[PDB]
Enzyme design. Structure first.
Site, PDB file in Angstrom:
ATOM      1  N   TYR A  56       0.727  -1.231  -0.095  1.00  0.00           N
ATOM      2  CA  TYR A  56      -0.128  -0.078  -0.080  1.00  0.00           C
ATOM      3  C   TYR A  56       0.713   1.487  -0.124  1.00  0.00           C
ATOM      4  CZ  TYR A  56      -3.593  -3.071   0.899  1.00  0.00           C
ATOM      5  OH  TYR A  56      -4.607  -4.276   0.880  1.00  0.00           O
ATOM      6  N   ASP A  71       1.141 -14.209  -0.601  1.00  0.00           N
ATOM      7  CA  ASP A  71       2.379 -13.484  -1.149  1.00  0.00           C
ATOM      8  C   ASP A  71       3.738 -13.789  -0.559  1.00  0.00           C
ATOM      9  OD1 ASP A  71       3.221 -11.560  -3.204  1.00  0.00           O
ATOM     10  OD2 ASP A  71       2.792  -9.922  -2.209  1.00  0.00           O
ATOM     11  N   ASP A  93       4.614   3.772   1.956  1.00  0.00           N
ATOM     12  CA  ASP A  93       5.852   3.404   2.102  1.00  0.00           C
ATOM     13  C   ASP A  93       6.202   2.924   3.635  1.00  0.00           C
ATOM     14  OD1 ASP A  93       6.001   4.588  -0.427  1.00  0.00           O
ATOM     15  OD2 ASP A  93       6.600   6.512   0.234  1.00  0.00           O
TER      16      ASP A  93
END
Ligand SMILES: Nc1ncc(-c2cnc(C3CCNCC3)s2)cc1OCc1ccncc1
Ligand SMILES: Nc1ncc(-c2cnc(C3CCNCC3)s2)cc1OCc1ccncc1
Lengths: 298, 298
Positions: free
Chosen positions: A16, A125, A18
């Site tokens: 999404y 993931d 940093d």
């Protein structure tokens, strides 16, 4: 509050926002903070879900959740800071990992997935960018954004299913997979750490996915047939079972020789030192420490 | 304007809204009007696309576009009225269609798809509910909503493709098919008109799609092996080719015996009369019309 932390430097980019290296204003403790920019009215159920899952996971192989703060469309998510950084960040400086290093990382990742799977959750993931290292050599898993996305999408066909051609049906399908897909990602990650990139990495993303669905698809192997042992090869062979029903679970794969052998966090310390080494020697003096027991020579 | 038409009765339900039998206030001409309720701010690019495609298609086997009117979140789309109604509506009253009736309908549908495919468009929802009949027995295709949906969605992976297990890749894929999928739907529709429902119709939609993707999937046949000719069977065998690359196009399938044989709109008139028949006889008088040429009998 957000005011309790000061962002020091960007250390990565999550699904999404940093990620920043951060320090606590009072305790001086280091932490990793994921800064997520939210648009007004947007589906918050997704970042909301990620926090909940992070909040719901307390395991030595999962990045621990410290807190989350939301201030005016800006959401911070605080978590423990893994000094080593991502494995991908590491092997970009470091060469390929050792077999024992890949083995150590793999066992720890499997330990993490074992926890998630018993809870009935999936990562979906698993890769080098999501496997972190602490300064002491511990392996933690990160990034529950994808997991959160998949959960949130549990909620409309284009056309009528029964009249769809097989190639249309393949694209119109949804779900139909379970947590065993994480085990495949472990196998791919094993190759990734070995060959600095996953198989088919040079192909286009869509092209790579299409090849995997073909009936004549055969799971990837390690290119160097002689550089790695039979166990490593066999470990990947098991982890990369095309058929999900016959694919070994997280516990079954933890019973495998490649990860059941003696493996300690020393191997990760080694890896970390190589990253802190961009030198094969240093000044030293080697002679007889004590004269009292110094063996004479004439 | 909308005021030029008066809605007479709902005659169906399109992909989006209701379809009403309608009459022109001045000309007295009959028309079909698709009333679509639009929410403020919603993606209009989809119904916008459907109108454009309808507007862009002028072929004897495609439902002709008369006009479209939008008044306060309510969009009307005017098109020619097919008195016979959907084929599905027909064979729900009528029994299964004749082989020659299925043949006639199939050729006309293929003629429609031939036009669409040369234009580079695809229907992607070819079924009995979308094949209409005029009162004179003509066959027109309808409902470009699905087509419009597919076009509009031409515009984000969940997770990273290369690390996806094959069963995840199957669900994460997109596109990868062409207009040849319409030909498959023709084959299924052929069965549908023959057996009052498509194959696998009793299964759940998701379950049916999953079975088609399996490597060991074999295209459906006609259950009654002896009720229909070899041509009809062979026609479906060609139309239902699992491999899209080897699947015959719309023109190749138009060269097939099953549809190249003598077929006229008489067969559809027959079908329409059977629907207008819910009686095997009626009053009559059969004797010698003219006494001048009436053959004597003693
Ligand atoms: N919790 C974390 N702790 C440290 C890092 C670091 C990333 N890169 C680092 C450099 C590597 C080179 N040496 C200096 C340090 S440290 C990332 C973390 O989390 C990432 C994350 C991603 C996505 N979702 C959540 C967390
Ligand atoms: N253009 C159309 N003309 C007539 C019908 C009819 C449907 N049902 C009918 C009954 C059948 C029984 N006998 C009385 C009449 S007529 C539908 C039409 O179009 C449907 C459509 C759907 C989806 N998108 C566009 C159009």
């Amino acid at each position: 509050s957000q005011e309790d932390f000061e962002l020091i430097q960007r250390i990565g980019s999550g699904t999404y926002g940093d990620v920043y290296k951060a320090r606590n204003v009072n305790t001086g403790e280091l932490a990793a903070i994921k800064v997520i920019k939210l648009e007004p009215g947007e589906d918050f159920a997704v970042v909301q879900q990620e926090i909940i899952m992070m909040k719901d996971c307390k395991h030595p192989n999962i990045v621990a959740y410290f807190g989350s703060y939301l201030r005016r469309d800006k959401l911070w998510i605080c978590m423990e800071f893994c000094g080593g950084g991502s494995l991908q960040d590491i092997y970009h400086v470091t060469g390929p990992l050792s077999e024992l290093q890949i083995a150590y990382v793999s066992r720890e990742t499997l330990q993490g997935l074992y926890y998630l799977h018993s809870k009935g959750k999936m990562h979906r993931d698993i890769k080098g960018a999501n496997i972190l290292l602490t300064d002491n050599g511990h392996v933690k898993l990160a990034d529950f954004g994808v997991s959160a996305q998949i959960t949130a999408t549990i909620a409309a066909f284009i056309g009528t299913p029964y009249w769809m051609a097989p190639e249309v049906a393949a694209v119109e399908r949804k779900g139909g997979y379970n947590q065993l897909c994480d085990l495949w990602a472990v196998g791919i990650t094993a190759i990734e750490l070995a060959e600095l990139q996953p198989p088919m990495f040079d192909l286009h993303p869509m092209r790579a996915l299409f090849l995997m669905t073909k009936s004549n698809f055969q799971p990837p192997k390690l290119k160097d047939k002689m550089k790695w042992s039979n166990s490593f090869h066999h470990f990947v062979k098991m982890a990369l079972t095309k058929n999900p029903k016959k694919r070994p679970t997280a516990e079954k794969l933890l019973q495998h020789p490649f990860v059941t052998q003696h493996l300690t966090r020393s191997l990760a310390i080694e890896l970390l030192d190589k990253v802190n080494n961009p030198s094969t020697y240093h000044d030293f003096d080697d002679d007889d420490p004590e004269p009292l027991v110094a063996v004479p020579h004439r």
